[PDB]
Every structure is written in structure tokens, then in C-alpha cells.
């Protein structure tokens, strides 16, 4: 891959920060930056073909509808789904909520109730935790969780086969430890109780090849804005056969088959799960982001990010009193790199890095139970994207040494 | 140097040598506050005089960054011994300075070492670090005053 | 109004359509077009200040968080709400769903149950109907409704409220008949049972001055993409005191204050109601749309749209066998104009208009109970925006006349 | 003119529609609605004594010129035909109207069916054209299930 060419696609990467250094953006794990192909795909659509989708029958409606459904097809190809298995939401969080609500719905045969068990993990982002707490609260189902190994991996030895388990929710790829999870083993175990699997793929889809059929998960969620796409668009994957059995979550226009004052019947999937005007221009932008990543190639993206991640782990590990949260090994590991600086609070570490133009996240990264499990209040997190460079990793390492000097 | 302008000597000093640390008896109110910038927390007590007119003690524990811990230390030096309304006025001057995005330098006559947090204001994310102990005190003072009579 | 200058802000209005004629876009009721000020406010944000909101502490995070919370404040000022009384959703539909789910939650003290009555209207868009049917289904509450007058207004004589009524949901402004509803009367009636009011304001916020404190409704929903703003952003208004009493709907990151594996406690409103990364650049865009409309002046917008509506009613009324669904007067009426052509199916009327470059919606406009009440399977719908012209209304009328000639009706 | 979409065959069947009105006997009955809001059909298929030939297609409902003309033309092409030949004609029609301007259709296979070639260019109206055809496909599959 031509890294200089790739970086030339992202206007924001030229920015000079308040400390006088060019941006080193190491927070793509929170939200990614946009290349011109994504900005221009969206603006070209809005200035030429902006009309209602699937509503009426004029020329702009036909063009907007074509762009909406071709975008769904492009994104499905990118993640190894069929077109009809993707549902658009405002974010990944909403996708996991949709599944968490349908699993409590009397009209769904696979809904959970008292005596049933929901399993999540102590590694999870809050988006793949709080909806399971709420589903347990509403239905009287029991919540359980896999624990975390000392190296920040899902602890497969921490739960055992239980016929009561009906839902197993787990990350594909940790947003803190960077661990790549044993999906095949977790699915095989889920199937031993006839449990449904819910894959949090927010940090896999931007960072590695993903084939959702191959993975054999029942559901998966991912986030447009983390994969170079627009804000305001998430995706739920659901196996065709499962979406067909599922009652709607949000209701309103566009998702009905019939309506009277007394009641309604509902459209087939995926229209069943898209209530009201969709994020039409954002689908166009997200499809452009999928084509962009596809043109680099997701194996090449993962190889580049793994080079940066290893350099970060090795450079930070070379600083006395700096500890990684997650493995130092690159086995089954990718972005990001979360770390503690002995004797320097994460807020002070992030401030020093920021003074040098290096943007990292400080805090719990939306995974507080994970931090608590390691007795940590907060970490600094450098996350990596296809546009980041070895020189930005060197500036990360230099900033962390500077923070030790400045406070030490 | 931009870093020195936010991290002034007073801040590094109170951070390294904090004052009135460690929860004490007696006390009229106890609060627990957490910085939305996940990593800073304070448990803070206020004791009032027999007649309820003066702050006689501010005791605290917890964990956080240089800015959150230094600010709580400076708070205790500014409000210990002061009339409840004078403590309240000092908190309002502090909040106005650090919330000012750098337009208010603060009055060293009202804030004392409080003024050392002026350079925090142009870093709006770090303003919540500085406000943690001060908003904790405002909460505890209003609970300790209400508690008093009766 | 400088109509020529306003139209110059909208690149799409120059488009030559497949029949050879410049676009005459009369479907802003479905989705509005974007001015450069909106497109540019969002692009400038994305290429300069794009960072996580309320998450970490770096410079881009501070700029993004500033843009998000200033956008909330700008939009609140536009609709007469306090900043903290707005919740961002993907669309107005989700905003109505959010209210419909919280009103069924055991943790809300105003939650509905067996014996309680939910009231909607036969005038409603499906977004302000289906969620109430589902709330009734989940809770055991029952659904009642106002009917519709022969002129397409809420029939206040068709329903008597009683003490069982806990929710009254209704349109501010019909997306089919164009009727402006009697909000202060419905609020007064709802209050006789201590019922909550839910206002569907999707067709008021873009087309007339709206002051949500004044209107005295408990909740309101509106749509960004109908008021010149981006896709992917709707708005829920809730009275500050009501939002403070409500449990969350969607859960996840950013809406929590504490978290263990066992449980969580939730942030205050409006953050309580915003789970996951918000639509940051779309808040920037919608704020720019509110500032754009504010600068024209919503009284001037309404006056302009009312002139187009009156000319449309006059011109269509003059065609033999054309009838309006909704008032033929301008009393308590705005956009849009929905109509039937005797002997010509709406699909055909719309195809003839489109051949002339005139875009109208054909179908039920997401208000099938309303169509069924008038014995209609579909209407053609001309909706108006600040960028539309009297010359475009003449093209609408000519195209409807042409559709009668083309299909051999006269 | 740029209609073209509205060919004489289409206007002709709309004004003079063939086989309209539900008839008996029938072996299955179906109710179909346009995703584009405004067209519906109730359609019956009768089969021969031996189940091998379509003996009747009867229907009712309301819709636009394109939905009603398409359904009239369907009945003309399919009545008296072998089930497999009926199925082949439906596939031919669907391929033509679904192709955007790309497939002209074969008049030997579609007869007046080819008049709907112009509709392919207007994807919203393709759903109008398909209503009666997909309704017949449903009712035929059901009538053949009924048979045994
Ligand atoms: C457009 C509209 C809706 C739905 O808004 P979305 O943005 O589609 O979710 C609801 N009510 C009325 C009156 C409308 O016009
Ligand atoms: C970002 C993230 C989410 C939440 O996605 P949103 O787009 O914020 O809703 C969930 N899980 C993981 C692992 C993430 O990184
Ligand atoms: Zn701090
Ligand atoms: Zn039709």
C-alpha cells in the first residue's frame, strides 16, 4: 500500500494542532477520519439525487432508492453478508439494543424469560453489556459473563455448559486489549445449548477481513464512523432465517405491510427493522468507505496496523514503569494499545501527548468493568488506522517518556 | 512552554504535597463525586462551627490526576475557617475563572493559590478535573448547612 | 423574501431532469433539499474538528464536543426549548418510539397499564400511530382516537376524554391535509385527566414559527431532513421535569454514570437518552439549517408557503374532476396540497408531472387510515418549501391538466 | 413522445381490459398490493381436469393504467397454456421489465407483453407492471399445490 497516497486522501491529517505540531491522530478507535471519496460520495448524492427512498415514484425517488439499496449491497459484500441480512441503525449501539429488545418480545419464539441465562463478557464495551442488563431486568432472565484472562483475553475456562444459556454476546475484537477472539469456539459452545450469538464487530470490520457467514454468528453489530464512514450509521447483521422470525423493534412508516387504527402487519426483513426516513446520504458515504477499504484490501490494512501496534507495544514496553493493558504478544492481537504509566495519571499522560499533537483517548474507553478487573481507574489508549505511520508511533513513545520526565 | 502554563508550580506542589487529605470526624455532610472524564473521584466531608456560620473542616480522600487532586488541596486552604457565605463566594469566583475559556484570570485576593488554575480554562476537558473537588465542596456545604438546624 | 438568492443556495435546484426540464421539486414534505450553508457547515466540521464527543480530553474531542453542544443550543433556540430538553435520535420516528417505550417502563411513574387509555388521531402519520398500537400491545392499555372532519381536521366532537386517558398524541400540522391543529385546546383537554401530550411537529418546525414552551406540550418530535438539515438526525423535545423522571430507552456507553457487570446507574437528561456515538456532524448540519431558517424568518417562510398553497388550491380547483383532500380555504392550513383527479390514478398523475420535471409524492403519504376514511387508495401530494415559486405551482397545475388530456378524460 | 412508457397496447388494455371480474371455478385465489401505495389485485387461477393447462385467470381490484394493462395482457398470454409455458412467459416478462432499458423482450414469447419494455427504464413503475404477474405466479403455484 502507498501510505503517503492514502494519507493525501484525508484533509484533516494536514491540520497543525494548538501546540504547533502536525496532528498525530491515534484515536480512530473512538471515531475514524474521512477520506475525500467518502465526503464527495455523500455531497455528490445530496446535490444531484436527494429524494425520498421507497416512497412515491418520481425520478429523484428512483435515484435515491437505487443509491440506498446499492449501498446496502456494497456493504453486505464487504462484510460477507447477503444484502437482505443488513439493517441500518443510527449506530452499533442501537443495533445491539435492537437484538436485546427483540429477545424480550413475547412474539419471538427464541425470546428469553425467567430461568433463562444471557451470557456476555467482562471484556465488553458498555454497548454489549448494558442492553443485556436491561433485557435481564425486563424478562427476569439471569445475566452471567465470561471473565478476562491476565493477558486481557476472554477466559474460556470461566463458564461451563448450561442448558439455560439462550444468548451469548461477545466482542470480535476488544476496543481496549486489541485481542482477536475465538469466535468459532464461542459459537460451537453457544450451539450446545441452542443459544443465539451476538458479535460486537465494531473493532473488527474497520481493521481486518470480516466474513459474517464464515463466522457463523446469528447477529453482528458494527459502526460506520469507525471504518472511515459517516456519523449516524450503524449496521446490524442478522442471519436471513432469523430476521424472518423476528418481530419489529421500532415501528412507524416504511416498516408496515398493512395498517388500520386497530393494528398493523409488518414488512419483511430488512425493511421490518427500519422505521421512518433512513440515513440515506450516510448509506452512500458508508458504501464509499467500504469500497475505499476494499480497494486497499483488508489483509493489507490489518498487516499495516499490526506493524504499528507491535512498534507501539515494543516502544512503550521499553519505558520503565509502563505496562500494557492486554497482551504484549501479537498472537491473536490487533489495535489498540492501552497502557498505564506508573506514577502518572492517564489524564496527565494524555495532556502531555496532546501538547505534542498526539491525540489518544484517556479514561475507561467505555469498558469500566475491564479496567476494574485490573484495578485501574483509567488508561491511555493509542488506536491505529490505515492512515497512521511509524513516525506517529515514535511521537507516542516520545510523549510518554516526556510525561514521565515532566511529572517524575 | 504551553505545558508549564497549564501545569503551574502551585498545581505540581499541591499534587505532590496535598493538604487536609484523609476523611476526619466530626463532619456534617459526606459526598462522593466522580469526574465525567473517567479517572478522578473524591469523597469529601464538610464540618461547620457550633453556630453553623463558618466552615471548620474540609476532609477528603480519593484518587485522580494532578489537576483534580491539586484543586481539592487548594480548595481546603481557601475555605477552612471562612464564613459559609464567604466560602460560597470563593467557589463562585473559582468556577467563573476556570469556566471562562481563559477570558477571566481570577482575583488572587479572593482565590489565593486558586488563581494557579487560570491556565486550565483554555483546556475545557481539564476544567472538569479542576471542578471535581470544588463542586464536591459546594454539594457537601449545602447538605451540612441544611443538616444544621435541624 | 429574496427568493432568487435563497434558490441560489441549493445546488440541486439547477438539475435538468430526464424529460429535459429543470427540476420543480414539490416533495419537500417527504424530504427537503440542502443549502450550501448546511452542506458546508458539515464538511468544514468533518475536515477540521472531527473527534469523539464527551470521550477523552484531546483538542479535537474539545472542538467536537463544543460543536455538538452548541448545535443542541442553536436548535433549542430555534424551537423555543431549553438546550437540555432536546434529545437526538436517527429520525422523528425514533423520537416518537422513545416516548412510546418509556411510557411502558415500570420505572416511569407515568407508565401506562391495564385500565389506561392512549389517544391518537385518524389524521396521523404512521410514526404517530404504530408505536401507540405497540405500547397498548405490550402493556394492556387500550388505544382510542379522534376521527377526522370532512375538511381533514381533527374532529374534537368524535372523542370524549375521561380519567383513564394517560397519553394524547397528535399532529401539529398534517403531512396530507396541511391543517394546523388546535394545540392549546387538545392540551387543555389532555390536562383534565393529567394526560401527557405528544406533538408530531415534523411538518410545523420546517414551515411555521414553533415555540415548544408556549405550546405547553409534554413531548414533541421533528425531522432534520424536512427542515433543510442532514439525514440521520431527528429530535425529541421533552419538558425538563418529565425527562428527569424518565428511565432510559436505548442503553450503552455515554448514557451511564456507574457500571459493574451486575448493573448500571444512568446519566441525567438529555445524555440519559443518547446511547452510543451520536450523529455529531449531522448536529452541526442541522444547527446550520436552524440558523439558515432563523435568518430568513419563519413568519416569512410561512407567508411564502401559504401564497404557494393558496395558488395551488386555486389552480387545481379550476380543473374539472380535481378534488382536494383537506381544506379548500387557507383557514388554519399550510403545505401540503393532496388531491384526487377523477378518472386518473395518482400513479399516472405523478408520472405525467414527473415527465414535466415536477416531483410530487403519490400514494398514502404514510397516512393510510386517513385515505381509507375518505375511501381513497392514493392521492398526489404537492408540498412546498421556502425555495419553491408561483411559476412551479403553474407547472403543477399544467401537468395535472395534461394528465386529464393524456388519459382521455378531457 | 417520451411516453414511450405509455404505449398504445398499454392504454388499449387499460380502457378495454380482458378477463376482468372474478369467475368460478378457480383452484386458488390471492390478494397482492403494490409496494408503491395505490394498486391491488385479487386473482384466481383455474387448471384443466388433468392439472397440465391454465384454463382461466380471473381478477379484480383497482390500480393505475400500468398495473391494470399488465394484468389484462397477462390473462391474454397465459390462459389455455401449459403450466410450464405459463411459468416461462412470467419469467420472460419479469426479466424484460426488471432489466432497465437492457432486455427488449421476445414478442413470440410475450405477445403484447413486450409493450411493457418502456416501463423497465422507470423502476418505481416496474412494481406496477409486476403486480398482476407475481399475483398469477403465486396463484398458479397454489393451484398446482391444490391439484396435488
Ligand atoms: C416525515 C414525518 C414523520 C416521520 O419523520 P421521519 O423523519 O420519517 O422519521 C412523522 N410525522 C409526520 C407528520 C411527518 O411528516
Ligand atoms: C465503538 C464501539 C461500540 C459502540 O459503537 P457506536 O458507534 O458508538 O454506537 C461498541 N463496541 C465496540 C467494541 C466499539 O469499539
Ligand atoms: Zn483528571
Ligand atoms: Zn401503479
Residue numbers in the entry:
A (entry chain B): 8 to 415
B (entry chain A): 3 to 152
C (entry chain D): 8 to 417
D (entry chain C): 4 to 151
Task: Tell me what the authors wrote about this structure, in their words.
In the present study, two proteins of the Mtb SUF system were characterized for the first time: Rv1464(sufS) and Rv1465(sufU). Combining biochemistry and structural approaches, we showed that Rv1464 is a type II cysteine-desulfurase enzyme and that Rv1465 is a zinc-dependent protein interacting with Rv1464. Endowed with a sulfurtransferase activity, Rv1465 significantly enhances the cysteine-desulfurase activity of Rv1464 by transferring the sulfur atom from persulfide on Rv1464 to its conserved Cys40 residue. Although their components differ, the NIF, ISC, and SUF systems facilitate Fe-S cluster biogenesis according to the same basic principles: a cysteine desulfurase takes sulfur from L-cysteine and transfers it as a persulfide onto a scaffold protein, which also receives Fe2+ and electrons to build an Fe-S cluster.
Assuming that Mtb SufS-SufU functions such as B. subtilis SufS-SufU, then Cys40 in Mtb SufU should be the residue accepting the persulfide from SufS. This hypothesis was confirmed by the crystal structure of the Mtb Zn-SufU-SufS complex, solved at 1.65-Å resolution. In this structure, the SufS-SufU complex is in the (SufS)2-(SufU)2 state. The Zn ion is tetracoordinated by three conserved residues in Mtb SufU (Cys31, Cys67, and Asp42) and the conserved His354 in Mtb SufS. The structure of the complex shows that His354, which is located at the extremity of an alpha helix and points out of the surface of SufS, is inserted between the Zn ion and Cys40 in SufU. The imidazole side-chain forms a coordination bond with the Zn ion on one side and a hydrogen bond with the carbonyl oxygen of Cys40 on the other. In contrast, when SufU and SufS interact, a sequential molecular mechanism ultimately leads to the accurate positioning of the SufU Cys40 side-chain in a cavity in SufS near Cys373. We estimated the total displacement of Cys40Sγ, from Zn toward Cys373Sγ, to be ~14 Å. In agreement, in the Mtb SufS-SufU structure, the electron density map at Cys40 revealed an extra density that could be modeled as Cys40 persulfide (Cys40-SSH). Taken together, these structural data identify Cys40 in SufU as the sulfur acceptor site during the sulfurtransferase reaction with SufS. The structural study of Mtb SufS-SufU revealed the essential role of the His354 residue in mediating the formation of the SufS-SufU complex via zinc coordination.
